[PDB]
Amino acid sequence: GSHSMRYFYTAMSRPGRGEPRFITVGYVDDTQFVRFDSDATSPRMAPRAPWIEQEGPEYWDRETQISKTNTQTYRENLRTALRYYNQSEAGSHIIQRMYGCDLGPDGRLLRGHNQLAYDGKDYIALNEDLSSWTAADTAAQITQLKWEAARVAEQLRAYLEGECVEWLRRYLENGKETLQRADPPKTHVTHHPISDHEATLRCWALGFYPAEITLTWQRDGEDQTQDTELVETRPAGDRTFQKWAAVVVPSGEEQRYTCHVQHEGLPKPLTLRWEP
Amino acid sequence: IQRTPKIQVYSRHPAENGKSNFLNCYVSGFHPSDIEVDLLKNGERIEKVEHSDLSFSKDWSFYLLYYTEFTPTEKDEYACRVNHVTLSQPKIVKWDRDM
Amino acid sequence: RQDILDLWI
């Protein structure tokens, strides 16, 4: 499969309630593997997946020191953002960052990522060239000038093409029993009368990993996108995900409808129907 | 600009009366990050409910999973109760084993 | 593992 590593940073200010909370979580694909929280009793980067626990004490010291530095850096960034947007010290604000790397089917770099947001809106992004920037507004243009002057993009490129890929490959090998295993969806169709005139057909996909999936209904072979209720893919709590798609069908017409499922864990796409 | 949470309440496995399971409330798509979530049994708050570590999606919105063990029965009613700055009053979504 | 480069906006 095609694998990714991501780090997510968030700082949330809370004037009058102490200093801004800073969190970090790391993922490989849909598996969280490390967490840090400045509101922890003793903040430290901590393991969240069995395959990261074998990294020695010096790994944890380095990750913790980075996260403790980042707590201070992102608090400074929240202060800067107030100046950039002419905002007072009374309001609560949020800065977010995502970065990491995607690998292709042969383990080579597919692309890298480095993006920030402020108050939930895109702020600045490193372009796919890993060499230039896209700023969302005139505030981020100030940041862009600073980062061009300091040749920030060159350093992020070196990380994304080097350590990011190398460490992702290490993690994939250490977690090869789980990270490199796709679990296919367990699929079935349920039938729920709504009245004498109509019933809901609900097509279920359960127990799958990773989260990417396609689940659709057809009537007489024609896609029913506008008439399908499609819930967001949701975590089950056991590593796996769930999703369903529902259509309202006239009584007696159930066999005109087919559900279609695509997932990495399936060798071929599936077709299912209501089986009374 | 703020975004109000989407809410789904559901079980880890298909519900079977008398069999132990996990009750999940997934809140997602919200911004800012402060959010309050309770799981209810017959209208009363279930204690010691745990939650996943806060994270966010590609569109920057946040998501959390709240969860607890429970054993569904025919008559016991379960729900998730959510509050967020975007909501005037708490939003209650009832658990329906068919969703 | 994380990048070490400090980003100040």
Residue numbers in the entry:
A (entry chain A): 1 to 276
B (entry chain C): 1 to 99
C (entry chain B): 1 to 9
Paste lines from the article.
The allelic variance of human leukocyte antigens of HLA-B*13:01 has been strongly associated with hypersensitivities induced by dapsone (DDS). The HLA-B*13:01 allele has been identified as an important risk allele for SCARs induced by a number of drugs, including dapsone (diaminodiphenyl sulfone, DDS). Individuals with predisposition to develop SCARs appear to possess specific human leukocyte antigen (HLA) alleles, which have been found to trigger the condition by mediating drug-induced T cell activation. Previous studies found that DDS-specific cytotoxic T cells were significantly activated when co-cultured with HLA-B*13:01-expressing antigen presenting cells (APCs) in the presence of DDS.
